[PDB]
mmCIF file of C-alpha atoms and ligand atoms in Angstrom:
data_model
loop_
_atom_site.group_PDB
_atom_site.id
_atom_site.type_symbol
_atom_site.label_atom_id
_atom_site.label_comp_id
_atom_site.label_asym_id
_atom_site.label_seq_id
_atom_site.Cartn_x
_atom_site.Cartn_y
_atom_site.Cartn_z
ATOM 1 C CA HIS J 1 97.558 113.109 76.585
ATOM 2 C CA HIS J 2 100.278 111.811 79.034
ATOM 3 C CA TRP J 3 100.317 109.502 81.946
ATOM 4 C CA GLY J 4 98.764 110.123 85.341
ATOM 5 C CA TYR J 5 96.561 108.561 87.966
ATOM 6 C CA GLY J 6 92.983 109.148 86.645
ATOM 7 C CA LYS J 7 90.359 106.954 84.931
ATOM 8 C CA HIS J 8 91.713 107.595 81.418
ATOM 9 C CA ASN J 9 95.476 107.863 81.974
ATOM 10 C CA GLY J 10 96.103 105.957 85.230
ATOM 11 C CA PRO J 11 98.141 102.825 86.017
ATOM 12 C CA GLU J 12 95.879 100.488 84.002
ATOM 13 C CA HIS J 13 96.751 102.531 80.894
ATOM 14 C CA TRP J 14 100.512 102.817 81.300
ATOM 15 C CA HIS J 15 101.388 99.611 79.431
ATOM 16 C CA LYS J 16 100.335 101.190 76.124
ATOM 17 C CA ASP J 17 103.180 103.779 76.162
ATOM 18 C CA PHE J 18 105.391 101.732 78.469
ATOM 19 C CA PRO J 19 104.973 98.009 77.627
ATOM 20 C CA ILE J 20 107.426 97.034 80.440
ATOM 21 C CA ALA J 21 104.466 97.835 82.747
ATOM 22 C CA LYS J 22 103.521 94.100 82.177
ATOM 23 C CA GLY J 23 107.084 92.921 82.724
ATOM 24 C CA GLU J 24 108.664 90.334 84.987
ATOM 25 C CA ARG J 25 110.040 92.613 87.749
ATOM 26 C CA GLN J 26 107.518 95.398 88.251
ATOM 27 C CA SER J 27 106.890 97.352 91.474
ATOM 28 C CA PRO J 28 105.255 97.814 93.807
ATOM 29 C CA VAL J 29 104.254 94.397 95.201
ATOM 30 C CA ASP J 30 102.358 92.991 98.127
ATOM 31 C CA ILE J 31 104.740 91.833 100.821
ATOM 32 C CA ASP J 32 103.489 88.539 102.233
ATOM 33 C CA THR J 33 105.206 88.648 105.654
ATOM 34 C CA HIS J 34 104.826 84.928 106.182
ATOM 35 C CA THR J 35 106.480 83.842 102.942
ATOM 36 C CA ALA J 36 109.282 86.430 103.090
ATOM 37 C CA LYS J 37 112.410 84.562 104.119
ATOM 38 C CA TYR J 38 115.065 85.740 106.578
ATOM 39 C CA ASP J 39 118.333 86.009 104.703
ATOM 40 C CA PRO J 40 121.489 85.615 106.915
ATOM 41 C CA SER J 41 123.695 86.622 103.974
ATOM 42 C CA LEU J 42 122.348 90.215 103.956
ATOM 43 C CA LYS J 43 125.042 92.623 105.200
ATOM 44 C CA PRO J 44 124.064 95.336 107.682
ATOM 45 C CA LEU J 45 122.257 98.395 105.925
ATOM 46 C CA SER J 46 124.079 101.669 106.063
ATOM 47 C CA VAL J 47 122.086 104.857 105.636
ATOM 48 C CA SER J 48 124.671 107.699 105.678
ATOM 49 C CA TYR J 49 122.772 110.940 105.385
ATOM 50 C CA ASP J 50 124.910 113.299 107.610
ATOM 51 C CA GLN J 51 126.272 115.370 104.681
ATOM 52 C CA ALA J 52 123.059 115.408 102.611
ATOM 53 C CA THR J 53 122.603 118.651 100.653
ATOM 54 C CA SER J 54 119.027 119.418 99.557
ATOM 55 C CA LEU J 55 118.663 121.926 96.732
ATOM 56 C CA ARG J 56 115.036 122.410 95.671
ATOM 57 C CA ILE J 57 111.519 121.088 95.860
ATOM 58 C CA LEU J 58 109.448 120.614 92.725
ATOM 59 C CA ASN J 59 105.803 119.869 91.889
ATOM 60 C CA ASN J 60 106.092 117.697 88.736
ATOM 61 C CA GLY J 61 102.360 117.097 88.224
ATOM 62 C CA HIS J 62 102.514 113.617 89.789
ATOM 63 C CA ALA J 63 104.151 114.181 93.180
ATOM 64 C CA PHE J 64 106.658 116.564 94.681
ATOM 65 C CA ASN J 65 110.373 115.803 94.589
ATOM 66 C CA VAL J 66 112.900 117.055 97.090
ATOM 67 C CA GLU J 67 116.161 117.090 95.117
ATOM 68 C CA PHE J 68 119.680 116.723 96.361
ATOM 69 C CA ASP J 69 123.096 117.653 95.206
ATOM 70 C CA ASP J 70 124.455 114.288 94.063
ATOM 71 C CA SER J 71 127.681 115.663 92.470
ATOM 72 C CA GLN J 72 129.735 114.017 95.248
ATOM 73 C CA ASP J 73 129.438 111.197 97.807
ATOM 74 C CA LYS J 74 127.337 112.986 100.370
ATOM 75 C CA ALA J 75 124.116 111.166 101.232
ATOM 76 C CA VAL J 76 124.625 107.398 100.410
ATOM 77 C CA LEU J 77 123.019 104.015 100.975
ATOM 78 C CA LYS J 78 125.142 100.904 101.111
ATOM 79 C CA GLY J 79 125.199 97.411 102.641
ATOM 80 C CA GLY J 80 122.145 95.280 103.111
ATOM 81 C CA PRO J 81 121.441 93.671 99.746
ATOM 82 C CA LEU J 82 123.578 96.248 97.850
ATOM 83 C CA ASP J 83 127.016 96.080 96.266
ATOM 84 C CA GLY J 84 128.834 99.365 96.236
ATOM 85 C CA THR J 85 127.543 102.829 96.901
ATOM 86 C CA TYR J 86 124.205 104.405 95.960
ATOM 87 C CA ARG J 87 123.831 108.188 95.983
ATOM 88 C CA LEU J 88 120.661 109.945 97.118
ATOM 89 C CA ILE J 89 119.224 112.043 94.236
ATOM 90 C CA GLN J 90 115.654 112.801 95.462
ATOM 91 C CA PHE J 91 112.793 111.769 97.597
ATOM 92 C CA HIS J 92 109.036 111.928 97.104
ATOM 93 C CA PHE J 93 105.849 110.434 98.488
ATOM 94 C CA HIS J 94 102.747 108.618 97.298
ATOM 95 C CA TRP J 95 99.542 109.256 99.231
ATOM 96 C CA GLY J 96 95.808 108.785 99.282
ATOM 97 C CA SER J 97 92.591 110.725 99.245
ATOM 98 C CA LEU J 98 91.874 109.097 102.621
ATOM 99 C CA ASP J 99 94.013 107.544 105.338
ATOM 100 C CA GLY J 100 93.020 103.983 104.303
ATOM 101 C CA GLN J 101 95.056 104.071 101.074
ATOM 102 C CA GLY J 102 98.103 105.724 99.564
ATOM 103 C CA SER J 103 100.972 103.348 99.881
ATOM 104 C CA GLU J 104 102.383 101.524 96.815
ATOM 105 C CA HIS J 105 103.769 98.491 98.609
ATOM 106 C CA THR J 106 101.365 96.665 100.861
ATOM 107 C CA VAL J 107 102.022 94.398 103.834
ATOM 108 C CA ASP J 108 99.777 91.325 103.889
ATOM 109 C CA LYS J 109 97.470 93.464 101.754
ATOM 110 C CA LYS J 110 97.458 96.311 104.217
ATOM 111 C CA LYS J 111 97.591 99.777 102.646
ATOM 112 C CA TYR J 112 99.307 102.555 104.583
ATOM 113 C CA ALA J 113 98.302 106.253 104.347
ATOM 114 C CA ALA J 114 101.428 107.109 102.343
ATOM 115 C CA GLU J 115 104.840 105.890 101.290
ATOM 116 C CA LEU J 116 108.117 107.748 101.130
ATOM 117 C CA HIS J 117 110.643 106.859 98.422
ATOM 118 C CA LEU J 118 114.300 107.853 98.932
ATOM 119 C CA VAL J 119 115.801 107.315 95.418
ATOM 120 C CA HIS J 120 119.465 106.475 94.971
ATOM 121 C CA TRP J 121 121.703 105.586 92.015
ATOM 122 C CA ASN J 122 124.688 103.275 91.819
ATOM 123 C CA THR J 123 127.855 105.326 91.565
ATOM 124 C CA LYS J 124 129.519 102.712 89.396
ATOM 125 C CA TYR J 125 127.420 104.025 86.465
ATOM 126 C CA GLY J 126 128.529 107.626 86.877
ATOM 127 C CA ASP J 127 125.168 109.401 86.703
ATOM 128 C CA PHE J 128 121.478 108.834 87.337
ATOM 129 C CA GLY J 129 120.563 108.742 83.672
ATOM 130 C CA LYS J 130 122.937 105.862 82.980
ATOM 131 C CA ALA J 131 122.262 104.077 86.227
ATOM 132 C CA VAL J 132 118.492 103.935 85.747
ATOM 133 C CA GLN J 133 119.200 101.831 82.601
ATOM 134 C CA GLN J 134 120.968 99.038 84.495
ATOM 135 C CA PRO J 135 119.490 96.082 86.434
ATOM 136 C CA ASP J 136 121.481 97.048 89.556
ATOM 137 C CA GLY J 137 121.419 100.767 88.879
ATOM 138 C CA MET J 138 119.038 102.022 91.542
ATOM 139 C CA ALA J 139 118.122 101.484 95.181
ATOM 140 C CA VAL J 140 114.896 102.829 96.623
ATOM 141 C CA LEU J 141 114.437 103.006 100.360
ATOM 142 C CA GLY J 142 110.677 102.856 100.976
ATOM 143 C CA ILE J 143 109.170 103.962 104.253
ATOM 144 C CA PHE J 144 105.501 103.634 105.196
ATOM 145 C CA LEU J 145 103.529 106.476 106.728
ATOM 146 C CA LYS J 146 100.610 106.002 109.145
ATOM 147 C CA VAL J 147 98.489 108.764 110.638
ATOM 148 C CA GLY J 148 99.018 109.434 114.300
ATOM 149 C CA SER J 149 101.538 111.708 116.046
ATOM 150 C CA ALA J 150 103.190 114.436 113.988
ATOM 151 C CA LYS J 151 106.627 113.835 112.492
ATOM 152 C CA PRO J 152 108.611 116.931 113.447
ATOM 153 C CA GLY J 153 111.172 116.244 110.724
ATOM 154 C CA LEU J 154 108.534 116.468 108.027
ATOM 155 C CA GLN J 155 107.150 119.808 109.081
ATOM 156 C CA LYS J 156 109.616 121.880 106.905
ATOM 157 C CA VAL J 157 108.391 119.923 103.841
ATOM 158 C CA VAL J 158 104.784 120.465 104.835
ATOM 159 C CA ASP J 159 105.235 124.257 105.236
ATOM 160 C CA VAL J 160 106.759 124.770 101.741
ATOM 161 C CA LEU J 161 103.913 123.008 99.834
ATOM 162 C CA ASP J 162 101.766 126.211 99.662
ATOM 163 C CA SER J 163 104.486 127.656 97.361
ATOM 164 C CA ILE J 164 104.445 124.706 94.956
ATOM 165 C CA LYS J 165 100.751 124.059 94.678
ATOM 166 C CA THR J 166 100.636 123.475 90.925
ATOM 167 C CA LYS J 167 102.491 121.477 88.286
ATOM 168 C CA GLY J 168 105.752 123.072 87.236
ATOM 169 C CA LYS J 169 106.209 125.140 90.395
ATOM 170 C CA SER J 170 109.439 124.838 92.338
ATOM 171 C CA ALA J 171 111.135 126.463 95.286
ATOM 172 C CA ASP J 172 114.566 126.674 96.936
ATOM 173 C CA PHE J 173 114.812 123.982 99.585
ATOM 174 C CA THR J 174 118.167 123.936 101.228
ATOM 175 C CA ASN J 175 119.439 122.372 104.433
ATOM 176 C CA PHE J 176 116.672 119.774 104.765
ATOM 177 C CA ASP J 177 117.877 116.729 106.717
ATOM 178 C CA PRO J 178 116.345 113.488 105.537
ATOM 179 C CA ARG J 179 117.471 111.723 108.739
ATOM 180 C CA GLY J 180 114.356 113.267 110.292
ATOM 181 C CA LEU J 181 112.143 111.029 108.159
ATOM 182 C CA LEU J 182 113.566 107.666 109.291
ATOM 183 C CA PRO J 183 111.934 105.277 111.814
ATOM 184 C CA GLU J 184 114.018 103.803 114.753
ATOM 185 C CA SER J 185 114.433 100.411 113.145
ATOM 186 C CA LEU J 186 116.182 99.634 109.882
ATOM 187 C CA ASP J 187 114.600 96.170 109.677
ATOM 188 C CA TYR J 188 113.602 95.707 106.036
ATOM 189 C CA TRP J 189 112.333 93.559 103.230
ATOM 190 C CA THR J 190 114.149 93.507 99.885
ATOM 191 C CA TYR J 191 113.362 92.354 96.387
ATOM 192 C CA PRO J 192 114.330 93.206 92.765
ATOM 193 C CA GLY J 193 111.835 95.480 91.070
ATOM 194 C CA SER J 194 111.212 98.609 89.113
ATOM 195 C CA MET J 195 110.486 102.299 89.117
ATOM 196 C CA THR J 196 106.862 102.800 89.996
ATOM 197 C CA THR J 197 106.283 105.702 87.633
ATOM 198 C CA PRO J 198 106.902 105.736 83.881
ATOM 199 C CA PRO J 199 109.183 104.720 82.319
ATOM 200 C CA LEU J 200 108.921 101.904 84.888
ATOM 201 C CA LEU J 201 112.463 100.723 84.335
ATOM 202 C CA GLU J 202 113.464 97.393 85.902
ATOM 203 C CA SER J 203 116.535 98.787 87.590
ATOM 204 C CA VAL J 204 115.653 98.928 91.272
ATOM 205 C CA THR J 205 116.699 97.042 94.360
ATOM 206 C CA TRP J 206 113.872 97.766 96.715
ATOM 207 C CA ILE J 207 114.537 98.151 100.446
ATOM 208 C CA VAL J 208 111.230 98.552 102.282
ATOM 209 C CA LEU J 209 111.406 99.348 105.997
ATOM 210 C CA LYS J 210 109.143 97.300 108.286
ATOM 211 C CA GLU J 211 108.565 100.112 110.750
ATOM 212 C CA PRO J 212 106.318 102.915 109.592
ATOM 213 C CA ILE J 213 106.753 106.555 110.621
ATOM 214 C CA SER J 214 103.748 108.404 112.058
ATOM 215 C CA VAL J 215 102.680 111.725 110.628
ATOM 216 C CA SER J 216 99.776 113.825 111.759
ATOM 217 C CA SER J 217 96.433 114.056 110.072
ATOM 218 C CA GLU J 218 97.134 117.762 109.553
ATOM 219 C CA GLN J 219 100.432 116.954 107.837
ATOM 220 C CA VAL J 220 98.970 114.507 105.318
ATOM 221 C CA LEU J 221 95.998 116.850 104.779
ATOM 222 C CA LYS J 222 98.504 119.424 103.541
ATOM 223 C CA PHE J 223 99.842 116.909 100.957
ATOM 224 C CA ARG J 224 96.282 116.559 99.726
ATOM 225 C CA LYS J 225 96.007 120.294 99.027
ATOM 226 C CA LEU J 226 98.547 120.032 96.212
ATOM 227 C CA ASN J 227 97.311 119.993 92.613
ATOM 228 C CA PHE J 228 98.041 117.701 89.646
ATOM 229 C CA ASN J 229 97.094 120.527 87.301
ATOM 230 C CA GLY J 230 99.077 123.588 86.264
ATOM 231 C CA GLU J 231 98.332 127.158 87.397
ATOM 232 C CA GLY J 232 95.114 128.510 85.964
ATOM 233 C CA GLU J 233 93.814 125.072 84.935
ATOM 234 C CA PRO J 234 90.834 123.281 86.508
ATOM 235 C CA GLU J 235 91.785 122.146 89.971
ATOM 236 C CA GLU J 236 92.444 118.416 90.403
ATOM 237 C CA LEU J 237 93.708 117.639 93.845
ATOM 238 C CA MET J 238 96.949 115.653 93.978
ATOM 239 C CA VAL J 239 95.667 112.547 95.794
ATOM 240 C CA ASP J 240 95.837 108.814 95.080
ATOM 241 C CA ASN J 241 99.146 109.121 93.226
ATOM 242 C CA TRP J 242 100.005 105.494 93.923
ATOM 243 C CA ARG J 243 100.456 102.537 91.614
ATOM 244 C CA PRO J 244 98.806 99.387 92.975
ATOM 245 C CA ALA J 245 100.597 96.103 93.711
ATOM 246 C CA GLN J 246 101.903 94.205 90.630
ATOM 247 C CA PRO J 247 102.411 90.452 90.116
ATOM 248 C CA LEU J 248 105.379 89.074 92.026
ATOM 249 C CA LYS J 249 106.135 86.529 89.289
ATOM 250 C CA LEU J 250 108.159 84.160 91.491
ATOM 251 C CA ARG J 251 110.518 86.778 92.769
ATOM 252 C CA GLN J 252 111.653 86.168 96.297
ATOM 253 C CA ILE J 253 111.183 88.803 98.994
ATOM 254 C CA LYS J 254 113.948 88.525 101.620
ATOM 255 C CA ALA J 255 113.760 89.831 105.228
ATOM 256 C CA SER J 256 116.681 91.304 107.123
ATOM 257 C CA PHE J 257 115.259 90.215 110.448
ATOM 258 C CA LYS J 258 114.283 86.915 112.080
HETATM 259 ZN ZN1 ZN X 1 107.838 106.655 94.322
#
């Protein structure tokens, strides 16, 4: 049937339906912190989430997406490596079955417990569907999660998951402030890459924050109670929904910090 994260339909299978899986600018990647080069030409990064308008949360059978109203310039990312303005459309996470895995990007081969992806599209292409087809169409802000202290800003997400346990379930999810999911530092690495789920389009400027956020064990345990399967189908816990690191292929990872 269709793509997923198991033995028979997982990442190692995706190239058959999506041949770009073996392409030249796939994500995620391992971030070698020693070979990443400080780039003085990077402009400062501007994360402007004050007027962000969340609409709904959805279990799509792979993750859950918190969706935003992107009909106007409300929540936008600009600066850093980017030209122009990138509008926030949704965020989601990738996580593990255990705390020792779950992130997509790795840092000197280190795997974090989870990874948050704030997905934005370049306004110069008018809508998400057109932007995701262009080499500079998307910008994903990636944030690592480690298990430690609770993240108070995540708790509203955590509490709604019981209502979207299975594939195809959604719920109203208004007034969620994504500022509550950001670490203190905006120090980042950047490189040109791709979507990490099918169709794996090579349209993304990746901006991966160096500083992880801490979430509690109880919080991530609640992510792990979600299901990949639909209602009244055999239960398959939604865990290990991460694509592993892909070949860098001579791409250059740039650091914003010395
Ligand atoms: Zn993602």
